[PDB]
């Protein structure tokens with residue numbers, strides 16, 4: 001299979017599903033290099049973040065495990081269609097790019113933290129990552145171009 005993708009088996013149900021270890025995406029359907037990609041993201045910061053402060057909150061005190069729970073609820077809502085990505089990003093992302101629906105503009109390799117970079121370049125146009133961990137906190141990344 002395509003890059004980072006391994007087949008796995010559901011604990012709840014027993015059907016196979018696919019997992020991507022670079023992006024942390026998982027999906028049921030079988031899955032399916034650019035100089036540049038364009039991504040949006042939703043960042044949730046925690047107490048061990050490189051900069052534990054955001055436009056949302058002067059001192060970020062939530063723990064990493066609590067940050068991960070928030071990320072997972074936003075991923076559930078985005079995948080069920082209850083909320084869309086841009087709207088959760090605008091309200092709840094700890095990055096100042098929240099003001100632009102999460103949009104970061106296009107970027108190439110060499111520019112982002114490697115785990116964010118690697119995730120962005122492994123996603124396909126249109127695809128969303130699972131929780132992606134960097135020194136900033138925890139990201140959900142949407143590749144738009």
Ligand SMILES: O=C(O)c1nc(-c2ccccc2)[nH]c1C(=O)O
Pocket residue numbers: 043050051053054094095096097104112113116135136
């Ligand atoms: O300080 C931080 O740690 C931070 N890191 C980021 C970020 C942006 C693009 C890709 C990955 C992380 N945004 C912020 C921020 O507060 O606004």
